[PDB]
DNA sequence: TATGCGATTTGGG
């Protein structure tokens, strides 16, 4: 008999095992084991959800597939133990995970215990098992409440979106609120218009001291800001024909305090800015550092530091830096006694280089965490700032700089590189004369609002009280690959389906899309977790406000229903029939479709032209002006002035669409001669017709399509422009049915040699290995070597040998050569 | 990468 300890990770199992001996046996349930599924209509709805809002939120949890073997293995080990310790993670999600464990195991409540720890160290684990607590039901309900609200919205708004807007549309309770933020930002940029203005730089020289770079600030006691080449040159020459004199010198002692230790949000931003880590990577690495006992729990909103940790770090600083770097009293940081702690090293003496079994990106993150934690307890840095004001004729120039006098906390956490006002100015004095050397003019433009990064969006979600440290990364992850937004060049871009759905939801679910209300809902869950509210009651108040909104939305758009997807007609003629085309938007994206679709199905034009959006490439990276210049490349709508989106119709026409589509019917067509991605592709002769075959890049790999609109004898594109042999027609088979559809099997040939696949591909997508038994009479060409035949044999393939062989099981195997077969 | 895979190249509103 012994004590059973259950965790959620083998990596977490091995590390906690180092501090548990004798009667403690640990086991890990790899992932979740129990969760929701993944009078007639309503009944089928609750079966799909696994939650009955009309029957007091009765839930029907179902064990996950492929987890049946782990549960039983965990069930067996339980009975062999006297007591059970649930060692899941700190947060509520972990509590709910621990609850699912107790539920599938069984037994009395006193048979279980809930341990809690900020870090996986000898001391911290000892303290956790010293006085284990019970499973907090209030915190579990705070999760299940959230989990239920998330599913209700997801499963009751989505079918409404299909009927009204487009198919394949998903909806999230908080995700729709995050998208709206991106959508709104997108509309601040498109509505913006960069304007031209100029700057001049006069590089001069001190009276035999050094070089002094200046910058014009004023002209005629008025701020100097020309708008074109002409006005500049007018000031340029005038500056050349002038004598430069210093007016004032202001020397001011400045400081810079270090930042607070990391919380989850601040960690993601610093890793994005300094390391270039996305939110997903940052949290993956942090979890690996946590489960290895290197850092504290990475889901936190506290900047608190334990007395031990503070004593630990202050000791290190004293030993390794000296008394100048140690403040008289510990540095305190404001947070949002929570019994929660910042993200920090578990041992300040462990360096990043001393990390075992941690990948490169995990070591970089630790170093980041380590340096911030050490610096957060060191002395402020001191500087000697000097600002110079220089007059020249009817002008007023300026220069600013500083000199490091005490590095302080920056000794352990230095900047990546120099900054703007980090130059060292030569010593001069009021009255000194400067000699002109070089005048440098520069053309600038006004900057539009900066796009969200994955981290800066989180920073915004936290500012508005939207979401929690436990859900920040899931929000960022779950708003992508939905067709609402996308991340390119480490920045968020709003898709058109984003703007459309967002607008729709704002019209029929105003409260659900409200920032403050969404923030209040997070509070209501905290209130449930703190025994200040009952969970089923909160759900009832939510579900009541939800149905009221949903009902009005389900109705027809005349009586307050949700407006259907609009359409903007173009002067574009259908290539199949003869009608004006319209710009419609789907889940997949934007395209052109014939107006001959509203007609009864007897006479509808099912022809569409996929509009391909131009690649917003900031790859040139023209500094912080990259997003600015990317906007200036856009045309302004001839109706509203809003920035337009560019699409390619054909290689001769180019469609510009207003940013406020479909609220603005504005568009333009740029006649020209454009190039597609596969313009430089190879050309080859078709086996059938004899015409040319060009390169098209589809979603299933690059391929060679014939240019004759009568045949489809294609070819596959290999690596580096190579083209495949003239293909081969598949071989069908009678009385060889499948295992899913009413389809039969056909013998194909691919990169994995020769195999056997469905006939209705890809509607079936069913494949198995052809038996040597398993035809031979219908075997085409040289494929008969396998049909020669030798436990029942089956045809295999080897990547190394690049030759096809056969094996058998129920371990026997054999190969072939230029002669025959051998075993 | 230990005897996993392959091949198709719209439709969408
Ligand atoms: Zn109310
Ligand atoms: Zn048509
Ligand atoms: Zn417009
Ligand atoms: Zn052909």
Author numbering: 2 to 39, 61 to 358, 362 to 799, 803 to 818, 825 to 844, 850 to 862
Please give me the paper's original passages concerning this structure.
Escherichia coli topoisomerase I (EcTOP1) encoded by the topA gene is the prototype type IA topoisomerase required for preventing excess negative DNA supercoiling. It has an important role in removing transcription-induced negative supercoiling behind the RNA polymerase complex. Type IA topoisomerases act on a single-stranded region of DNA to initiate change in DNA topology by creating a break on the G-strand of DNA.
Here, we present for the first time the structure of completely active full-length EcTOP1 in complex with single-stranded DNA (ssDNA). There is one full-length EcTOP1 molecule in the asymmetric unit. As revealed in this study, TOP30C actually contains three 4-Cys zinc ribbon domains (D5–D7) and two zinc ribbon-like domains (D8–D9). The extended ssDNA also interacts with D7, D8 and D9 but not D6. Each domain comprises a 4-stranded antiparallel β-sheet with a Zn(II)-binding site on the top of the domain. The Zn(II) ion is coordinated by four conserved cysteines from the β1-β2 and β3-β4 loops. Binding primarily involves parallel π-stacking interactions between the guanine ring moieties of G29 and G28 to the aromatic side chains of the residues Y622 and F616, respectively. However, it is D6 that forms extensive interactions with TOP67, mostly through its unique helix (α1 of D6).
